[model samples]
Target chain A: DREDVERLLRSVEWAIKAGDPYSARILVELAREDAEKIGDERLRREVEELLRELEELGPHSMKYIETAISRPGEEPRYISVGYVDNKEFVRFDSDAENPRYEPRAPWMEQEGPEYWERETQKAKGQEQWFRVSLRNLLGYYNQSAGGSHTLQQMSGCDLDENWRLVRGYLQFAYEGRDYIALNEDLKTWTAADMAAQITRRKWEQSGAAEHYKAYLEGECVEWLHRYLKNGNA
Target chain B: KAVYNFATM
Candidate 1:
């Protein structure tokens, strides 16, 4: 008996997340077969597109990367590096204790000081959230709050030729291991482990998933095009 | 137009 198509597709996601390139391709083949059998043109096309990207990169990606550490005495407890197409254009860090937003690329300088101020504020807000979330996670994992823990969020989208959305992804990691990720369809979250299942369902029920999808599909792409127009280099 | 709840429980 043939395996379920949905299971095959989910396996592909897990394979890629686990960094098993060989198994990722193998799962894609199985999923593609069912896609064709069911006459799912979109599914087939998306499978092919991801395969091509695996072999050769073509899409432009905009990424918002943040890392928070619970090193009680560390200088910088949190930081953010936002980039497009491998070019880091903006950065925020707690190094100065004031957490200033700094433009890293020449193109980003076109924005006024007010824009940077807004970004700095946003960074601080997210940093606060990271601390609270870390506390919650420590309790869930039954780890001592005094121990060092790390929290990371990586959210972004890949835009294909003609600026069409190819994939929008949001991922969280705890202790440098994948915790959970958002599905490409923007309707579900995939928990990487049992501990993450609680957080995933909490976020989904709180409607946080909706906000993430909106940001990835809308604001993320808009920023990507704007950066492209202004020249990433 | 959407606000992200980075701290949602």
Candidate 2:
């Protein structure tokens, strides 16, 4: 029974990642039923949290979550993955063999080559920026020569049923810990620690904070609208 | 052949 519940929950995540929330919701419901039967409190709680996250995502929303890792001797040191309404839609990696932002959804493939090219350039630039940020973070934490370090970023706009940009958020993490988060309303950074505080001050002085705030409200929302218009099918 | 599981979506 435990194995069945775990298997079903895992499948739910896979479906969500694959851009099929319909299937994800269904799989999770089945998982919930299985967990209830066994009276597995921990498993039930996990299932409830998964369901709550899905519910909180709302019916119409788009998000891009990117994770860049500085690994030793890795072919692709930087990578990014994006999701729309719980569905993975794009991926990018700095692999020498082939470096580009790839459209993972069928609807995403509808965009022309030039669009892909532009996105590829954008991703490449961000990879360079992320590399610099990682170097700066290592200095901040005095973790020079560390084996591996990770930077995670999420930026997205939450929209209502009318598809209007109701709210937007931008957040960053270093080494799997909260680093800095944007206060969209006040247009300020809420640093999680002293290391983040230093970077936040520097970013504010450099106007990078304002630039990213504008990005979340403007271009990020514009892209989400365009993607929603594209349709998943 | 790489068998696929369509049941999981």
Candidate 3:
């Protein structure tokens, strides 16, 4: 037999308490559907409220799948799956060495750049390992989530007309960091430029044909287009 | 109890 709608609602409540915003969003959608079926205004309102909360939390919890390949200038190209597991973390090809890259508790201190270089030399022209320490992963997620909200805010018509959403998007995409060293022209950039400059550096470096395909086929190209066109059609 | 969760590095 199908589970009752109330059970689903309870599941959503549990997800919310667990800080699983993504799961909570899914459950809220279900609750809304059930409420609509039963003509329950109060239940619908509750679900709506849950959705609002999820929206407020932002897209950090949303599972992002990159359909692009690693282009030149992109650093540490790798795809990431799974959540913040304190006991076990995913190591990218770029982080094959370096004990500091090991998956562990989020609060652990990261190995310094010198240590990273030592680890890299040990790996030696083999594949570089990129470790997404639990702490770093969560930090990236939170930063990206906040950046998304800021982009939305900057795009609002009520905001300053000079506030360019495209620039904000690019800044967020680059994680507000100058990792991608663009040349003086700022127009022409190498693949490596894109790799280091972007926030999802690892994913950008994956070099998978599908990844590039996604960039060509997805909103990224459109964003770039709009950026170049100055918001024109 | 108020629980705090954070990521480091």
Candidate 4:
């Protein structure tokens, strides 16, 4: 039969990581069939949920996003992104990055140097993976959005610039350190707390009751929508 | 409630 099966598996994973969740879903299904032929439950599980996202989108979807990664305890790394909506007001993010989270060696227990080659290629992808959304981040931390709030909600800050700083706080939290310090609390705080302090405490006067929208759309041009224009993986 | 939201994620 099908000799190119191994190549097909790698290709499917590559597609999901490289900016086309929908198309990748199709390939994953194909890989699933190959998995069945080989009786590999591991690969079958990998291809399964990828089908949820890709009905199809021609292209250009990657252009609108806020990216981050989640590395939970001994689990896979989860990549996330907040998609930028038109005219600025972005929706809260909701998506996954592990659709292509290949295990260490699909062929580790199964085969030869060809599969070993795949093991080498495994270095090229992610766990939480290529795209992360707000919920992804939340679930990774085991918290919910209800507990979360924009810097504006806590301190009544109104400077749009403050919003941008808060946005910076989140990226630094996810991509760098999960939290930042506020007043030497020693107990510590997540990036959001630092954001709230920066927005609220830094600009305590001349403010509004709430300004979280800024966190989502504050620097719409830069932080909010600053992602690869044509591609990713 | 204030510190509660930012405590975990």
Q: Give lDDT tens digits, candidate 4, residues A102-217.
A: 22222223333563344223222321233323344455456534322111111111114332222212212332222332222212333355443443443234322123234223
Clashes of each: 0, 0, 32, 15
TM-score of chain B of each: 0.46, 0.35, 0.39, 0.15
By DockQ thresholds, what CAPRI class is model 4?
A: incorrect
**Candidate 2, which segments miss by more than 4 Å at Cα?**
A1-58, A74-76, B1-9
Rank by lDDT (best first): 1, 2, 3, 4
Look at candidate 1 and tell me the lDDT of residue A115.
74
lDDT of 2 by residue, A164-207 (tens): 77877777766556678778673677999998888777767766
Per-chain TM-score of candidate 3, chain B = 0.39
Identify the superior model by DockQ, candidate 1 or candidate 3. Answer: 1
On DockQ, the leading prediction is: 1
Q: Model 4, stretches more than 4 Å misplaced?
A: A1-73, A81-212, A221-233, B1-9
* Tens digit of per-residue lDDT, candidate 3, span A1-233: 02234545555554444334543455466567767877777777877876777787711111111100122133333222112211112121332343222322232224346644543343332122222322243354453321111000000011123422222111111221222221223233233343333433443344333432333234433433333243232
In candidate 1, which residue ranges exceed 4 Å CA deviation?
A: A1-58, A74-76, B1-4
Ranking by TM-score: 1, 2, 3, 4
Clash pairs of candidate 1? none
Report iRMS values in order.
Answer: 3.7, 17.7, 16.5, 14.4
Best by TM-score: 1
| Model 1, span A31-93: residue lDDT tens | 676678778777778778767855762678777767665643443277677767766677776
